[PDB]
């Protein structure tokens, strides 16, 4: 199998019409080409129970989140090239009143493998976090072919494409693979 260790290292947002920012989750998962989720790769902490879904700390009216989260993830070497991770970004308020439907708000992806054969390369990713209708939002067919990283849509400011909305917002991870 293959380890790629995958940290939430920081975030930037903001939120317009609300002059009070978000309470924002970030939610991790693996998918594959077809949007498919892939199950049990995911291992956070000790790293003895796996699992499909992870959700970060939230952190109240926090514009700027450092997370600095590092989970585990481990796919067969067969699955690899065929997988990517999606980072789903939601805002809660936590009241025990219920009041918002806390919906995505936005999302952020990168590819495990390179159309080099290669696979990520480790290190900070700053991923571009896009925005968009929930549903459109959650299609890999949509996203996975519009620019993974900052670094990479330069090499094409640029606020839609794809009818995609590319946000303000700022996301950053580092990846390490074994």
């Known amino acids: 199998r293959n380890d790629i260790y995958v940290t939430l290292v920081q975030g930037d947002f903001d939120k317009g019409s609300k002059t009070t920012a978000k309470n924002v989750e970030v939610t991790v998962s693996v998918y594959d080409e077809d949007g498919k989720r892939l199950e049990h790769v995911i291992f956070p902490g000790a790293g003895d129970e796996a699992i499909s879904e992870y959700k ?18 481990a796919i067969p070497i067969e699955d690899v090239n065929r997988s990517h991770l999606r980072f789903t970004f939601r805002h809660r308020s936590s009241q025990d009143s219920k ?33 968009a209708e929930a549903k459109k939002l959650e299609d890999a067919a949509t996203y996975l072919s519009l620019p993974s990283t900052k670094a990479e849509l330069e090499e094409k400011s640029m606020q839609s494409l794809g009818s995609c909305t590319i946000s303000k917002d700022s996301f950053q991870i580092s990846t390490l693979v074994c």
Do not use: C, N
């Not at 970060?56 to 993830?73: D, G, H």
């Not at 952020?108 to 700053?126: I, P, Q």
């Open 99 to 131: 009041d918002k439907s806390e919906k995505i708000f936005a999302l952020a992806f990168v590819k495990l493998m390179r159309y080099d054969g290669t696979t990520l390369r480790d290190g900070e990713h700053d991923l571009i976090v896009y925005k």
């Open 56 to 73: 970060s700390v939230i952190y109240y009216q926090v514009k700027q989140p450092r997370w600095f989260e590092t989970v585990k993830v």
